[PDB]
């Protein structure tokens, strides 16, 4: 299974937000796992991508891996 | 590439003039980075209609891949970019081009709740039975997330 940013970012259909990450040196979802809807904002992901994100990194959370 | 490297980096941060003093210079229309994106893939996701012109009048190719199935067009319809869509579609994007997860540009003009961007696709021959790895169309997705506008013009299409 892939940690990725950039497969998480595909399976939550915001493939267009990777170069947001990509420019911070953010390339693993456990890198981003503790980040807050502000944090997404302070990256300029577009509004309309914040809240899918946050759900995306909660639902990580939500696993306990 | 150095000039290709330049060229995606002015491409990112969308300076217009500095993209068509590269390509005058030579620089590689298609060059890509680490994730398989082109020039055309940055403009086309943040947005600088005026460089996916340049690009293309200078030979991007359309319907260039990254590395998870992602051709510019789909980038361009998630955030919203109706112009860029409607640039690209006249340069020959493939309107139902799928990625790695199956979505086409209508799955995710109807996930991000982008209206006018679902009708310019269905005019230019969008699949509205296309069906994604989880099963859905882009009328399921537009459902899933209360783009209510999009359920009324897919809504039994």
């Given at each position: 299974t892939?940690?990725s940013?950039v497969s998480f970012?595909?399976?939550?259909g915001?493939?267009?937000?990777?170069?947001?990450?990509?420019?911070?040196?953010?390339?693993?979802?456990?890198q981003?796992?503790?980040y807050?809807?502000?944090?997404?904002?302070?990256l300029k992901?577009?509004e309309?991508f914040?809240?899918?994100?946050w759900?995306?990194i909660?639902?990580?959370?939500?696993?306990?891996? | 590439?150095?000039l290709?490297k330049?060229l995606?980096e002015?491409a990112?941060?969308?300076?217009?003039?500095e993209?068509?003093?590269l390509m005058a210079?030579?620089?590689?229309?298609n060059?890509?980075d680490?994730?398989?994106?082109?020039?055309?893939?940055l403009?086309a996701?943040?947005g600088?209609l005026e460089?996916?012109?340049?690009?293309?009048?200078?030979?991007?190719?359309?319907?260039?891949?990254d590395?998870?199935?992602?051709?510019?067009?789909?980038?361009?319809?998630s955030?919203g970019h109706?112009?860029?869509?409607?640039?690209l579609?006249k340069?020959?994007?493939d309107?139902?081009?799928?990625?790695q997860?199956g979505?086409?540009p209508?799955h995710?003009?109807?996930?991000?709740?982008?209206?006018?961007i679902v009708?310019?696709?269905?005019?230019?021959?969008a699949?509205?039975?296309?069906?994604?790895?989880?099963g859905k169309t882009?009328?399921?997705?537009?459902?899933d997330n209360?783009?209510?506008?999009i359920?009324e013009?897919?809504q039994?299409?």
């Amino acid at each position: 299974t892939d940690c990725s940013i950039v497969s998480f970012l595909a399976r939550l259909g915001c493939s267009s937000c990777l170069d947001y990450f990509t420019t911070q040196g953010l390339t693993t979802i456990y890198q981003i796992e503790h980040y807050s809807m502000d944090d997404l904002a302070s990256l300029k992901i577009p509004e309309q991508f914040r809240h899918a994100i946050w759900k995306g990194i909660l639902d990580h959370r939500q696993l306990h891996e | 590439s150095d000039l290709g490297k330049k060229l995606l980096e002015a491409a990112r941060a969308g300076q217009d003039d500095e993209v068509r003093i590269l390509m005058a210079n030579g620089a590689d229309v298609n060059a890509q980075d680490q994730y398989g994106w082109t020039p055309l893939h940055l403009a086309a996701a943040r947005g600088h209609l005026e460089i996916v012109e340049v690009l293309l009048k200078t030979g991007a190719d359309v319907n260039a891949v990254d590395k998870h199935g992602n051709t510019p067009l789909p980038l361009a319809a998630s955030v919203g970019h109706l112009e860029i869509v409607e640039v690209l579609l006249k340069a020959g994007a493939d309107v139902n081009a799928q990625d790695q997860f199956g979505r086409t540009p209508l799955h995710l003009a109807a996930m991000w709740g982008h209206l006018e961007i679902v009708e310019v696709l269905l005019k230019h021959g969008a699949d509205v039975n296309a069906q994604d790895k989880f099963g859905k169309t882009a009328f399921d997705i537009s459902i899933d997330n209360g783009n209510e506008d999009i359920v009324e013009v897919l809504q039994k299409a």
